[PDB]
Amino acid sequence: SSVQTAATSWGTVPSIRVYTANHGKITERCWDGKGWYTGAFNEPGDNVSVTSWLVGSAIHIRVYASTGTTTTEWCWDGNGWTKGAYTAT
Amino acid sequence: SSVQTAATSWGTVPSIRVYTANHGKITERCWDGKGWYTGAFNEPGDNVSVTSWLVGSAIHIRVYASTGTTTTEWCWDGNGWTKGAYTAT
Amino acid sequence: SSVQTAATSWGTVPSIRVYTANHGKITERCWDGKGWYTGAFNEPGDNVSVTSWLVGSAIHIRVYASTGTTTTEWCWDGNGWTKGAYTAT
Ligand SMILES: OC[C@@]1(O)OC[C@@H](O)[C@@H](O)[C@@H]1O
Ligand SMILES: OC[C@@]1(O)OC[C@@H](O)[C@@H](O)[C@@H]1O
Ligand SMILES: OC[C@@]1(O)OC[C@@H](O)[C@@H](O)[C@@H]1O
Ligand SMILES: OC[C@@]1(O)OC[C@@H](O)[C@@H](O)[C@@H]1O
Ligand SMILES: OC[C@@]1(O)OC[C@@H](O)[C@@H](O)[C@@H]1O
Ligand SMILES: OC[C@@]1(O)OC[C@@H](O)[C@@H](O)[C@@H]1O
Ligand SMILES: [Zn+2]
Ligand SMILES: [Zn+2]
Numbered sequence A, B, C: 001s002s003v004q005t006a007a008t009s010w011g012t013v014p015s016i017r018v019y020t021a022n023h024g025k026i027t028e029r030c031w032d033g034k035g036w037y038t039g040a041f042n043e044p045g046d047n048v049s050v051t052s053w054l055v056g057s058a059i060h061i062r063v064y065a066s067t068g069t070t071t072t073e074w075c076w077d078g079n080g081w082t083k084g085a086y087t088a089t
Helices: none
Strands: A004-010 A015-022 A025-031 A036-044 A047-055 A058-067 A070-076 A081-083 B004-010 B015-022 B025-031 B036-038 B047-055 B058-067 B070-076 B081-083 C004-010 C015-022 C025-031 C036-044 C047-055 C058-067 C070-076 C081-083
Touching: A004 A047, A004 A058, A004 C058, A015 A047, A015 A058, A015 C058, A036 A058, A036 A070, A036 A081, A058 B004, A058 B015, B004 B047, B004 B058, B015 B047, B015 B058, B058 C004, B058 C015, B070 C015, C004 C047, C004 C058, C015 C047, C015 C058, C036 C058, C036 C070, C036 C081
Parallel strands: A004 C047, A047 B004, B047 C004
Antiparallel strands: A004 A015, A015 A025, A025 A036, A047 A058, A058 A070, A070 A081, B004 B015, B015 B025, B025 B036, B047 B058, B058 B070, B070 B081, C004 C015, C015 C025, C025 C036, C047 C058, C058 C070, C070 C081
8 A cells, every 4th residue: 555654854954854654664764965875763663753853963853653553652862763651641 | 544643843852742643533642851641632533744833932833634635724822722724725 | 535634834924834645636735924825736646744944044845745655755945846866765
């Protein structure tokens, strides 16, 4: 079925991250001003949303991956992807 | 059917808002730096998107809730959710 | 099927762009503080996401339009929409 994307950007270059839910798997493509490349994020999901914010020049990213009625938060704080404290209720 | 989410964030703490369209109903979870709690937003929708912007330290949120071919805009400007002027045509 | 939207905003007025994927067609509605109107963007797609950034006072917008397993990026840089370099792999 048709894939589903979510996008975020930061700075003025800019950096862009595009997340794609594709048949149960979410992957990440990256732009930092000089070509698209595959990012490290790879987790299960039928649906994806994202938001990001800067603290100074350090980017923080939250990706929300949903399967069925279960949503899992993934956190990027500059040094690795980790599961977040988000709960749905 | 998997639920569908949309997310926005502001500031450096940050504040995060996650909207979940769950089989026709959109609810909202909130992070302001010290735990996830349920927000005031409760409206019908199969699909949801969001954007937000700061005027000084005041957050303004716009949520776009879609059912069928009807999209309703909901506005947070500090003191309650109100229907916005958005129309598709 | 219910339509699916993506929203972005910039400035303090603000300007808002809302993209709606509606049965294969993505269209755009615009707010610059003085009423909603229809924007130039009109391209095919079953799913849509968007991000934007400012460089000074100039807005740059990226719309990710997906049909099947194909995602096409559309770029606004002040002077018309053009296809972007985004690729999924
Ligand atoms: O520089 C690329 C990278 O480290 O940027 C932050 C996140 O997007 C990561 O998944 C990604 O691999
Ligand atoms: O740094 C991780 C974290 O504390 O960031 C704020 C929220 O995203 C939380 O759910 C998350 O666990
Ligand atoms: O402090 C929580 C709250 O008031 O923040 C602004 C909006 O997200 C509201 O729906 C939400 O209840
Ligand atoms: O104050 C509310 C409002 O004027 O804000 C800007 C746009 O979101 C409009 O649709 C909306 O009615
Ligand atoms: O002034 C309206 C407009 O030029 O703004 C930038 C883009 O949203 C365009 O599609 C749109 O027509
Ligand atoms: O100016 C257009 C462009 O170079 O902007 C940055 C990225 O969005 C690229 O995919 C895109 O082609
Ligand atoms: Zn279901
Ligand atoms: Zn339909």
